[PDB]
Symmetry: D2
């Protein structure tokens, strides 16, 4: 209103300032025609992907949804992956989770929020998968563990899609990554699930969970 | 590989450089706990939303999919909207399209791409909706018109979801926007579909199409 | 109580069968793989087995509100890819019905909740033919929409990557769109019938054109 | 040819009915609104009408591969919200079947295409019970998975916002999970039966525990 009019003014000021400087930005960008990374992050979008990775303009192909999920039967996410992998021939897909995630917390609370709750049931199913692990943890540290287990689970989901299986069976080079950053520092931490094939997917996911299962005593009660 | 290791180095360099400067960035961000805008853009993600709008960190709630679609029965997009509107109480949803869009072009070509084609059928259905308009145009200008008609159609879809209808029937303040930017300049151009209610949705969408239907003769053959 | 009735009915039926030495279950298992995919409405007014008098297990069945093949519905598309790629079914039939609650719900202004999102595809279809349906007597609209809806769903299925790929590799696959009137149960072809991309384009445009000729008793 | 057969059968059937002055269509229309939602498998080995001997139009029906209620499937959730919110159906039944191709497909290593994504939910379910199913003789696994799958689907439906909201507002809604053996057609309750969140939690955990006791003839 005031806000939208501002936004257009902000934008104009920027775009025009880019003209009055014949700015290479839109030239540099158009030369990176095709992205090299598919980035699956959360709609929370706290610290922008472009800022975490400092990749140049147009390098990232991006999907965001609530709590950075790759649901087995989500047409939306799968289309993005199939297009990225089969059409764009992208060789890295990054799933990025983040701490203090609204979806993670909502998946965890009892409030019935409406339609989103259904979306969040998959995180709840995951929470239950590692219920022993998570109840062996401090209530105020659970959201953070769950965020990481989530990322690891989402990578495992990604690597089980028929799109990714079929890209690997057919020879394509494709690596899967699962990372989290603390919103207070923005350090990307690899969660351990990294696959370039079906066998490394399974070995890698089992190892990551095993690794997540050794608790620092500053996490236990 | 080399690329991923680089990314982590880039990221480390950034995050650490943010420490050695006790940088307010992550403090400022955490004070914008809740977003004020839902931004539905394309996974192409050419010019980042944060750069178009120059909004401060954490202000945007973001969804991206191929060709910035709001499909009536997409659980993924709808969850993002229902969460944004009902939980986050966001009062502006922006659908942003962009020129030279990979999905737009793919929707337009005959190549069978696999799974993504199904996703793109909705754009094809739209292309057919304005077939008279678009065949009354220069072949090299069609993708650009289709990009804009798309945005306008997606806003019209958004404003017809039960989530948005029900937010309006129940008194909530919610405005819908549909914009495109040229990837060569980044000027956000409003496409005319702007609604704050069901009646302004319909009036606004009819007017936008009517307006799109008057051609400059530098667009006609 | 309602459930107790249903277990009882079920027991009476399945025992009536065991003690009779019923060849039914035996005969059902000798038909391991179906030959038709039938995509119908959840209203399911008269069952596909009654309409088609097919041998048990010949039908692979998907039902959803108003018998849609929505471009991006994982569920129906999963059913289709499995019937086509895996089960090698060579006939997919979409079958509407008159007096379809799904069709009536799509046209009413009422705000019903989540199902309205599902039915917005129908509304998009009603708009594409708003001229025709608008040249028509409003009380006859639902029945025309029932039929147009079926024709669009066949056009939709014919355009799925799954069907196109089945056709590009020589697989024999044909698509059908039928409606039956709930008052007599007769299966009426709606004219869209495809065995290929080209035949899909032609009968579709043909079906619509033939649907768009209104009887002057209904014309506005 | 296969289609000509089906129109012929259909004509013979619906005419047999008209000339007989069949009370069937009349009686069908006096049952405008169904009372059960039935979520079944597309394999559709024996039809819900045969299993339940219900009066025509009592069943509102959704079928998909392996009878799933997937948390985020618009299609099934559209069927459920419409049966529950709009049609006021007070019974939702999920019904598995033994010798389910969907269940067999989920367990096989084979890469079948898009349908494998659909079946990954089943695999997640198989893993959740991999201990139990792993304590079990491999050739008996599919039948146990058929039954566990049904129990998880009821647990899934019981957790949808739609069912929870129907329960939070006092609406009478109960959920059922049944399996029938394709060799005899008997409807067997799998123990998860819910009329509320609390009863959902208890019978679910109860059903699994009772499913997890293996007959020593099958124990590893
Ligand atoms: Co988040
Ligand atoms: Co684009
Ligand atoms: Co119907
Ligand atoms: Co089955």
């Amino acid at each position: 209103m005031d806000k939208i009019k501002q936004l257009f003014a902000n934008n104009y000021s920027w775009a025009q300032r880019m003209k009055e400087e014949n700015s290479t930005y839109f030239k540099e960008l158009a030369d990176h025609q095709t992205p090299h990374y598919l980035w699956i992050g959360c709609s929370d979008s706290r610290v922008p992907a472009e800022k975490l990775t400092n990749l140049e303009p147009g390098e990232l192909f991006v999907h965001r949804n609530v709590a950075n999920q790759v649901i087995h039967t989500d047409f939306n996410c799968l289309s993005v992956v199939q297009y990225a992998v089969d059409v764009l021939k992208i060789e890295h897909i990054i799933i990025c989770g983040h701490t203090n995630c609204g979806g993670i917390h909502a998946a965890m609370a009892d409030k019935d929020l409406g339609l989103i709750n259904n979306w969040l049931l998959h995180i709840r199913d995951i929470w239950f998968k590692h219920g022993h692990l998570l109840g062996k943890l401090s209530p105020e540290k659970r959201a953070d563990m769950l965020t990481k287990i989530n990322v690891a689970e989402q990578v495992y989901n990604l690597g089980r899609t028929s799109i990714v299986k079929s890209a690997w069976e057919r020879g394509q080079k494709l690596s899967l990554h699962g990372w989290v950053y603390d919103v207070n520092d923005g350090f990307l931490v690899d969660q351990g699930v990294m696959a370039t094939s079906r066998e490394t997917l399974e070995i890698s996911y089992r190892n990551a969970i095993a690794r997540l299962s050794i608790l620092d005593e500053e996490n236990i009660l």
